Amino acid sequence: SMSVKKPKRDDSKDLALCSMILTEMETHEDAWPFLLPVNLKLVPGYKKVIKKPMDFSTIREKLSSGQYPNLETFALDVRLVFDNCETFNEDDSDIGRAGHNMRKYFEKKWTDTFK
């Protein structure tokens, strides 16, 4: 509350560390469905169904231009990528499997770097 604060957790390395995680996600062999925005002209149903599209290149641009206020807003966008994938793709598909794999990969790196 006013003039009453918990001890200050050091967040000075968060930007660099989120960048490193994102690099590891970009270079994963199963990243290909997620590297670029879904083409809304060429994929029927996507525009109407997926209210907030997100992809790794869009996260990289937001990160590089100070559009994440803190590490939690960064994790919310990475999770959005996988939530969108599960919304549009069957589990038993190459893309559906890719999204589960990448979400697992992310969640471990996130715990090990920050928790």
Structure method = X-ray
In angstroms, rounded to a whole number, what is the distance separating the alpha carbons of residues 92 and 63? 32
Strands (E), 1-115: none
- Is the Cβ–Cβ distance between 59 and 17 less than 8 Å? no
Tokens encoding 92: 């038993």
The one-letter code for the residue type at 106 is F
Resolution in A: 1.7
CB 99 within 8 A of CB 89: yes
* Contact call for residues 110 and 21 (beta carbons, < 8 A): yes
| Residues 10/63, Cβ–Cβ less than 8 Å | no
Q: Could you give the CA distance from residue 53 to residue 91 in angstroms, rounded to a whole number?
A: 19
Yes or no: say if 18 and 26 are a contact pair by the CB < 8 Å rule. Answer: no
Q: Which two tokens stand for residue 51?
A: 């209210």
Counting other chains too, the contacts that 83-89 makes at CB distance below 8 Å and 24 or more residues apart are: 84/50, 84/52, 84/53, 84/54, 85/33, 85/34, 87/49, 87/50, 88/45, 88/46, 88/49, 88/50
Question: d(Cα 86, Cα 58) in Å, to the nearest integer?
Answer: 19
Evaluate whether the domain defined by 1-115 bears CATH number 3.40.50.620. no
When computed from its CA atoms, the radius of gyration of the chain, rounded to whole angstroms, is: 16
Instruction: Determine how many CB atoms are found less than 10 A away from the CB of residue 80.
Output: 17
